[PDB]
Amino acid sequence: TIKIGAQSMTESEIVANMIAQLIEHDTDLNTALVKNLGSNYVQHQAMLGGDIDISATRYSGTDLTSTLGKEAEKDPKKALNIVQNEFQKRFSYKWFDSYGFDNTYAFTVTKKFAEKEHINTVSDLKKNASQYKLGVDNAWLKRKGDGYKGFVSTYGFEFGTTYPMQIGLVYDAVKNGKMDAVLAYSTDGRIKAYDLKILKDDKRFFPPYDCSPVIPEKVLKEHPELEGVINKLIGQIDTETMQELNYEVDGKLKEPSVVAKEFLEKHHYFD
Ligand SMILES: CC1=N[C@H](C(=O)O)CCN1
């Protein structure tokens, strides 16, 4: 039975279910979901411990700056290449090419706030930063490399008050005027659904966050038919598609298993 890890994100659950169903459609392997993994660190430790055989969703800039303890590379291709080579060298883990989307931190505001405050870029926030409330996830404030400390030293300012919360809550918090700005995830469907504005990262502070599955070479060796299944999804999901899938769960309240199934059926399980 292949143990598939899902991080505590709607996106991770959708993709974990998608992998599970594709594996069972194509092969005689049974699968199990290991859900609610709190962070990439928890995912990685679970893989080191053999608690999971597959990480459904890992993000290049995230593991680059934490797991690998490296500078935040700003080029998508170079960042992916470093992560892939390092995962092979250090762990004999295969970090696959991307599904096709980058899920980045994105400073997000209502269009009303942007018009009132004259905001197009992250640097535009500087003039009144002390007046703003910023909603962020439960980890970003303490992250090294791509975290708040790095943000401050690059952009040269702090927000008046920063509020860490479950990432799922930031979209309503900003829509409802509770926060002036939130550090959202760019693949969340509620950004488009709520007509929000993503601010340009004008100093290119954030590294890329291309999303890929990760699987130990040992697992791929034990189950030679596994790589071919995973290959079917590589390059097949762009951001717009990911946003739509995310919204199926977060806006329409559908089970990730159901959303995954419907996606696979539409694409005839990629043959
Ligand atoms: C920028 C980003 N952060 C998440 C995290 O830090 O695990 C993963 C998906 N996107």
Nearest to residue 132, comparing CAs of 88, 186, 98, 177?
A: 177
Taking the C-alpha atoms of residue 252 and residue 26, their distance in angstroms, rounded to an integer, is 29
On whether both 82 and 131 belong to a single domain, the answer is: no
**CATH assignment at residue 143:** 3.40.190.120
Q: How many CB atoms lie within 10 A of CB 239?
A: 16
On whether both 129 and 85 belong to a single domain, the answer is: no
Locate the ligand 1 atom nearest the alpha carbon of residue 140 and give its number: 6
Sign, Cα dihedral of 251, 253, 257, 258? negative
Question: Atom 9, ligand 1: which residue's CA is nearest?
Answer: 103
Q: How many domains does the chain have?
A: 2
**Do 135 and 183 contact (CB within 8 A), yes or no?**
yes
Taking the C-alpha atoms of residue 54 and residue 36, their distance in angstroms, rounded to an integer, is 14
Q: For residue 15, how far is its CA from the centre of ligand 1 (angstroms)?
A: 15
On whether both 109 and 204 belong to a single domain, the answer is: yes
Taking the C-alpha atoms of residue 80 and residue 29, their distance in angstroms, rounded to an integer, is 29
Q: Is the CB of 247 under 6 A from ligand 1?
A: no
Ligand 1 pocket: which of 166, 185, 198 to mutate (most atoms within 8 A of CB): 185
Residue 26: CA atoms inside 13 Å, Cβ hemisphere, count?
Answer: 22
Name the experimental technique.
Answer: X-ray
Taking the C-alpha atoms of residue 235 and residue 222, their distance in angstroms, rounded to an integer, is 25
Resolution in A: 2.1
**Contacts with 23 (C-beta within 8 Å, 6 or more apart), sequence order:** 2, 29, 31, 226, 229
Ligand 1 pocket: which of 8, 9, 151, 170 to mutate (most atoms within 8 A of CB): 9
Q: For residue 211, how far is its CA from the centre of ligand 1 (angstroms)?
A: 9
Taking the C-alpha atoms of residue 15 and residue 21, their distance in angstroms, rounded to an integer, is 10
Strands annotated E in the chain:
2-7, 31-37, 54-59, 93-95, 105-109, 133-136, 161-164, 181-185, 197-198, 211-216
DSSP 8-class letter at 39: S
On whether both 88 and 112 belong to a single domain, the answer is: no
**Do 239 and 187 contact (CB within 8 A), yes or no?**
yes
On whether both 70 and 92 belong to a single domain, the answer is: yes
Residue 210: CA atoms inside 13 Å, Cβ hemisphere, count?
Answer: 24
Sign, Cα dihedral of 150, 98, 34, 137? positive
SS3 string, 147-204, reads CHHHHHHHHCCCCCEEEECCHHHHHHHHHCCCCCEEEEECCCCHHHHCCCEECECCCC
Three-state DSSP class for residue 93: strand
Q: What is the extent of the structural domain holding 1?
A: 1-103+209-271
Residue given tokens 């696959």 in the structure block = 96
Domain end position, chosen among 184, 208, 232:
208
Taking the C-alpha atoms of residue 159 and residue 140, their distance in angstroms, rounded to an integer, is 14
Question: Atom 6, ligand 1: which residue's CA is nearest?
Answer: 62
Taking the C-alpha atoms of residue 202 and residue 151, their distance in angstroms, rounded to an integer, is 12
Residue given tokens 């977060």 in the structure block = 250
